[PDB]
Amino acid sequence: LKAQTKTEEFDAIKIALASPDMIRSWSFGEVKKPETINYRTFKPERDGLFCARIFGPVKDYECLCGKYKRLKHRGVICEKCGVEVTQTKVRRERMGHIELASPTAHIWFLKSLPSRIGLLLDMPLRDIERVLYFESYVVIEGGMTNLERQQILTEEQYLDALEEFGDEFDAKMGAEAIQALLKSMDLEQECEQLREELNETNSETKRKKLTKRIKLLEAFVQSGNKPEWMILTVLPVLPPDLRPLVPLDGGRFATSDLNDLYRRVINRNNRLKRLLDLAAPDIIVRNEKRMLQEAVDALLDNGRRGRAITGSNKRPLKSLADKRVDYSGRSVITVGPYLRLHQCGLPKKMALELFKPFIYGKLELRGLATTIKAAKKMVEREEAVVWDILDEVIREHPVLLNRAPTLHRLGIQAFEPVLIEGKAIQLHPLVCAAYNADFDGDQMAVHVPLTLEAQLEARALMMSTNNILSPANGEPIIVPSQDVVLGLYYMTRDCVNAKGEGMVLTGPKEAERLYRSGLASLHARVKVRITEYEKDANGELVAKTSLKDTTVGRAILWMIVPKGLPYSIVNQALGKKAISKMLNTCYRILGLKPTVIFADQIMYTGFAYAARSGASVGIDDMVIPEKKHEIISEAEAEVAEIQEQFQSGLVTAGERYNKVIDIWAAANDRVSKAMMDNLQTETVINRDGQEEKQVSFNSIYMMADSGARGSAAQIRQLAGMRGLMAKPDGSIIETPITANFREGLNVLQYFISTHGARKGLADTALKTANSGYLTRRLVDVAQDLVVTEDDCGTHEGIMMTPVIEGGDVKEPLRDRVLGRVTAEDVLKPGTADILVPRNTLLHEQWCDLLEENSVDAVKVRSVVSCDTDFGVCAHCYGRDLARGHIINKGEAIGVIAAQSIGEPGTQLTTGGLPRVADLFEARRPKEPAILAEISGIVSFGKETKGKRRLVITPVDGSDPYEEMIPKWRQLNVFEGERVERGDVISDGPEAPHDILRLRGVHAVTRYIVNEVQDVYRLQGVKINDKHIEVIVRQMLRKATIVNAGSSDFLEGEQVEYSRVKIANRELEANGKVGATYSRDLLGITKASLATESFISAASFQETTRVLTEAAVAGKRDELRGLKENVIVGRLIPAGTGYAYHQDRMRRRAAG
Amino acid sequence: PQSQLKLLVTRGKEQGYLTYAEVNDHLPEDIVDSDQIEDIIQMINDMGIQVMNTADEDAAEAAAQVLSSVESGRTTDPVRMYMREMGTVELLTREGEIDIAKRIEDGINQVQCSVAEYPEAITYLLEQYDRVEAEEARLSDLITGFVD
Amino acid sequence: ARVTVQDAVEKIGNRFDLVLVAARRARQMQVGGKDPLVPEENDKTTVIALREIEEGLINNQILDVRERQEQQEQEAAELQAVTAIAEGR
Amino acid sequence: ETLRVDPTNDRLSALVEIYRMMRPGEPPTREAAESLFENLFFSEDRYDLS
Amino acid sequence: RSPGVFFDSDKGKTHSSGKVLYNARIIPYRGSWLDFEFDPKDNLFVRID
Amino acid sequence: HARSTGSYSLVTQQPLGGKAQFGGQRFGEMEVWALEAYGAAYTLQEMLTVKSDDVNGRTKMYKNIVDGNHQMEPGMPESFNVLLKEIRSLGINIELEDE
Ligand SMILES: [Mg+2]
Ligand SMILES: [Zn+2]
Ligand SMILES: [Zn+2]
């Protein structure tokens, strides 16, 4: 079958140098005149920057002169003025050209610091420019006389050399010279010489540059490009519609600067033609040629040179080198607690305007409207019927909600529209956590999933209810926020004595019936008969009932708790954490739907009982310690004691300072732990006896304790004194703020407080941008990484143990191993007993089985060790997702990894967020520790010059290794003792490169993850090891070859490519010629630099250099990646489109 | 005692960072250009960046930078190279103008006389005037007038 | 409405393929070549298709079989028509 | 030590170096160096602290 | 910034030597800036603007 | 604010409010990452192709929307086509290979 010619669905893309004839191919005419339009009849002047003949008609299917105006005549070229009558859109398509009188250098290739003409000719830049401007001659193919080929001469020198040799010697100057140079160049011969010369002389300096240049040359050869094309003969002109002359109000016009530039080029070129036909002296024509060069250079890239300015406007004209979406909206948002988790309140008018085409279609579908026009007129009139029609089109049609600071994927979520009277969008409360959206006037945007696939994608993926879990960690993101948790807290709780204390009831029903009638208090100690279930039988619910000692409120609440959950979960005090673990266990037991509806009911009851609770905040609710003033007085005794000591000279200045600052710092804690006790347990009440005391029912304490809002620090700032603020200088004042907010703050205290507040504001405002930037670098380094294979089937993995830092368990084993697959079957303390067989996803039950037994460690497969090339296998990755099931095939994990790492990054403050940045960047620390290069006994050699050399002595092996260690740095290593490779030869931080090379891949992959997780966990942030492990996988992506037999020696190359080539070379080919390598750690920003697709690289990297460097190589972008396919505007090679791209990829490179 | 550009380089490397102002003055007196800096910040930035995070490769980012240091004279800006190129040509003497003009006269009169010595150059004019009086042409398109 | 696709995901495990297949089916219904396999509650073709996935009466295998059958349903029609095109000889 | 790092000698030389520093690329002139340097910080027109 | 003379330091970061540095700056209401600044070699310098 | 189908920019065809009828919301890079994290390609394609930058795709879609047929015949976004022309306007030859 004949392949094809006319437009199909294309694959890949190719970029290369353009031939003069190739350029003329695109051009449908030459633009010979600087003129644009006629100035009266605004029609385009023929063959000019704007032309109907060359480019296209000014109006659809209408000839310029107006001869053929009919839609019938089409392929007709008019006789008066040749214009094919066709849509005006082809004036946005057809290109043009200009034939340059003299050759002109292409500025991108001339100066883009790989000066391409230069390093292709092995000729320095200044010589090339000195030639181009006629400031000197350059030899070309000098033959056998006196002179080198690339050698440059001057006026006198050239004259003399010419007088000596008339022929068999050649020299030119200007652009023509460079062109002749390039054209004359034979790549083959140069190659043949370079190889021999490479082989003969042995020096690093020589053969390094030699091999680099021969590689460059052969690359350029295989490219298909020819050197001449770097020098411009024909100059293409951009379609007129892309540089519009379009009019405006008041008769005035507006136009692109490209018209000014192109006009300059045309004029100078024409003047050059004339000056050639007029036989001007050289001094003139040379100047005209230089001016033409300037004009062309300014037209292409005006960045360089002197930056020519547009007419009458100082601003430099924008050169050639120099998204809004329909069906959408936005507005202020409100609560709507009545909503189910799966829906959101959508304003009537908004929904009307959004679904307008759907409304038209349905309206004339049922026959309510004669035609679409009539439909428009109807909804424009807003006739009463159309509303009901809207209710039809809204029902199963989801909408997308999005907020401004989008970080993690939950930043956009799909809901089901519920028509609302008002202009505000009602957003479900439980989702307010995911969006990070307060109600203080934040706005949200709506989108409409038009195509069927978009609706189903919205419902099965982007839906609210389908994501109940944070992608960062398995913990529920639907956890009730504030009002609700204060509701369940006030509900589930007990005081010492109340109505119905001690009585007994048949069940929750008459418990609630007792409460609602005012007979029994919401919180009272009561025994009630409850029936709790358990699914502990195989796939089956077991029922049991008993007398539980609980409170009326907990009994009432139990009515909501579904099925197999134990009563024990609602028998606590029900704080925010317990109320979260409730939902979590509910999810890992009953499944999704029960968890959803449970969550809803939890919110409703929360708001309800919080409303009934009558919880408020008064000024007397904040209790200042009675002993505060006394503590103040005592510490204030200390300060003058130390003052009197400084006056007697017993203590120094700095010592006095530290002492006073310490005594105040202690005073703060004293007052804090006074007010805390007083605000906590001080309620003293009586049941049938004298007294007894319990946790206070004081309002603000309830809020802070429940987890609704407020915290011990802030409560500390309300009641007790607040801190000891500090100037911007960083120095901390030894006279702290003794007054609190409840008390009045005098002028000073507040003044000094202002700073702290502002620096807080400024710093937060800055860390926003920092977090964002980090997320950007992170998604750039990952991106295209997506689950591709299913199971790579490697036994390889990392050893998981609890962190055990300092004292007991800074992080458990169960957490680290949860949701992860086992590398190999682990054992009980006794063996021939396989509890967890081979590779099995470790879920809740499994981890609990591991917890039953005493197991201290589990080997776990990771994304960093996965044998799959160009991606990750689902088996190795893990489970975690919005769903508890194992990761799907084709889900893009790099994006979510980066998002999950960067989203909490706002909450981060050596240490802090910049520490995370330095970590991912692989940067060597300021004053690092040096590890032992090789095991064996060591000794200190030589003496003091700049360094004192350390000589290693391996037992069996040789001792070529001697490392020169600067001696002014205090050492660690014992000069009389042996040290293993990767031991401490000094203290201080260690470069991850060293950890990788000397210790191991798993060693360094553990170092990074543990360090960054130290940074996050110190701030109380949950991020699964997974994401960081994928970022690490991306960091170590490259490697440097050591041995040979296939590829070049020092080449940095993909571990994927390499491993693929050696595993392929271990068999077939040479028996094994396979080459060794060395894994290499690359900082995220550096690893992001490496991308196969040039369209991808042209985005985030520097555009010019990328396009040029790719163009000279004739690089062919096969797409295959996310970014490039986004740019080109086709389905992402992941997720839903993964099937497509899969299928297609297989159809390609095949029969 | 001398070689300039090493020093801003060798220092910029040892400090690990250099202010955007640090390089400007530390640059040799050779390259002062404004748009010069634009790509050299990228050059130093891939090898040890300070734009006030990079590639540890270095190597060729020095050899080419030294190639940019040798490329630091001619400031391009064709107004300059022109003003200078024409500035060489010597001024004319009042008599020299007469010399040159006389040379012109000799030349042009030579080619005219060479034309007059061609028989076909005569016959053509004759036939053309035969076309003029035949209303196949006009008097203005043949002669601009004789001497007169 | 269909609030949770958990069951539909349970049937066909990929969950993206869920969206794809359900899209195909929802297309079979939307521009009518066909009719629902489950009672329509006024649920749009989207939710109807999802329900059809839940009940296990619709999936890639089934749809492919049905379409492949239809190829021959139409092929049996034109059997005289296209064999009548022996003019190519 | 500063004088030791001074490439110039007399007034005119320093003026040339300053003129070349301010407006490089173009040939210096005596009247130009004097005019410039006097017009910088010493002119009632181009300079005021008020 | 008020017109007049201004004496600054730029201690620390400059050349990472801890040797600090010292600079004076003459800022006119209207006109060119007159800057004086030291270096690690203790050689006084001057820059216009 | 709300918009279904409004006016369009001349230089690159993109939704632009000219009547005080507002232009569409801007779908940014981070939002694209959000759609990328979800397995939703079609939502994204229709987001940056048919709903916005495709001069043919928008109308060809609209007709289907009113016809009662939800599909998309995406074609190539006008932005990348403009970039094809801008790149190709230089000495750079950019081609689309195979079939
Ligand atoms: Mg806010
Ligand atoms: Zn015509
Ligand atoms: Zn794997």
Swiss-Prot record, chain B:
Annotated domain remarks: Contains 4 domains, connected by flexible linkers. In the active conformation, the domains are in an extended conformation, each making extensive interactions with the RNA polymerase catalytic core.
Compartment annotation: Cytoplasm
Cleaved signal peptide residues: none
Sigma-70 factor domain-1 as annotated region, ranges: 1-63
UniProt family annotation: Belongs to the sigma-70 factor family. RpoD/SigA subfamily.
Complex formation: Interacts transiently with the RNA polymerase catalytic core formed by RpoA, RpoB, RpoC and RpoZ (2 alpha, 1 beta, 1 beta' and 1 omega subunit) to form the RNA polymerase holoenzyme that can initiate transcription. Identified in a complex containing RpoD, the RNA polymerase subunits RpoA, RpoB and RpoZ, CRP and DNA. Interacts with Rsd; this prevents interaction with the RNA polymerase catalytic core and with promoter DNA, and as a consequence, promotes transcription from promoters that require alternative sigma factors.
Gene: rpoD
Name under which the protein is recorded: RNA polymerase sigma factor RpoD
Role of this protein: Sigma factors are initiation factors that promote the attachment of RNA polymerase to specific initiation sites and are then released. This sigma factor is the primary sigma factor during exponential growth. Preferentially transcribes genes associated with fast growth, such as ribosomal operons, other protein-synthesis related genes, rRNA- and tRNA-encoding genes and prfB.
Annotated coiled-coil segments of the chain: none
Lineage: superkingdom: Bacteria
From Swiss-Prot, chain C:
Entries under SMART domains matching the protein: RNA_pol_Rpb6 (SM01409)
Pfam families reported for this sequence: RNA_pol_Rpb6
MF terms in GO: bacterial-type RNA polymerase core enzyme binding; DNA binding; DNA-directed RNA polymerase activity
Key words, A-Z: DNA-directed RNA polymerase, Nucleotidyltransferase, Transcription, Transferase
Superkingdom of the organism of origin: Bacteria
Enzyme class, UniProt record, top EC level: transferase
Role summary: Promotes RNA polymerase (RNAP) assembly. Latches the N- and C-terminal regions of the beta' subunit thereby facilitating its interaction with the beta and alpha subunits.
Quaternary structure and partners: The RNAP catalytic core consists of 2 alpha, 1 beta, 1 beta' and 1 omega subunit. When a sigma factor is associated with the core the holoenzyme is formed, which can initiate transcription. The rRNA transcription and antitermination complex (rrnTAC) consists of RNAP, NusA, NusB, NusE (rpsJ), NusG, SubB, ribosomal protein S4, DNA and precursor rRNA; S4 is more flexible than other subunits.
Stated name of the protein: DNA-directed RNA polymerase subunit omega
Gene of this entry: rpoZ
From Swiss-Prot, chain D:
Parts of the chain that traverse the membrane: none
Modification after translation: Acetylated on several lysine residues in the presence of glucose.
Applied value in biotechnology: Co-administration of salinamide and rifampicin or salinamide and myxopyronin suppresses the emergence of resistance to both antibiotics.
Domain of life: Bacteria
Family: Belongs to the RNA polymerase beta chain family.
UniProt subunit comment: The RNAP catalytic core consists of 2 alpha, 1 beta, 1 beta' and 1 omega subunit. When a sigma factor is associated with the core the holoenzyme is formed, which can initiate transcription. The rRNA transcription and antitermination complex (rrnTAC) consists of RNAP, NusA, NusB, NusE (rpsJ), NusG, SubB, ribosomal protein S4, DNA and precursor rRNA; S4 is more flexible than other subunits. In pull-down experiments interacts with CedA.
Known role: DNA-dependent RNA polymerase (RNAP) catalyzes the transcription of DNA into RNA using the four ribonucleoside triphosphates as substrates. Resistance to the antibiotics salinamide A, salinamide B, rifampicin, streptolydigin, CBR703, myxopyronin, and lipiarmycin can result from mutations in this protein.
Protein name: DNA-directed RNA polymerase subunit beta
Source organism (scientific name): Escherichia coli (strain K12)
Record gene name: rpoB
UniProtKB/Swiss-Prot annotation, chain F:
Residues included from the entire protein: 1244 to 1342 of 1342
Disulfide bonds: none
Biotechnological relevance of this protein: Co-administration of salinamide and rifampicin or salinamide and myxopyronin suppresses the emergence of resistance to both antibiotics.
Top-rank lineage group of the source organism: Bacteria
Entry similarity comment: Belongs to the RNA polymerase beta chain family.
PTM comment, free text: Acetylated on several lysine residues in the presence of glucose.
Coiled coil: none
Protein name: DNA-directed RNA polymerase subunit beta
Assembly: The RNAP catalytic core consists of 2 alpha, 1 beta, 1 beta' and 1 omega subunit. When a sigma factor is associated with the core the holoenzyme is formed, which can initiate transcription. The rRNA transcription and antitermination complex (rrnTAC) consists of RNAP, NusA, NusB, NusE (rpsJ), NusG, SubB, ribosomal protein S4, DNA and precursor rRNA; S4 is more flexible than other subunits. In pull-down experiments interacts with CedA. (Microbial infection) Interacts (via flap domain) with Escherichia phage lambda antitermination protein Q; this interaction renders bacterial RNAP resistant to transcription pausing and allows it to read through termination signals.
Function: DNA-dependent RNA polymerase (RNAP) catalyzes the transcription of DNA into RNA using the four ribonucleoside triphosphates as substrates.
The organism of origin for this protein: Escherichia coli (strain K12)
Gene: rpoB
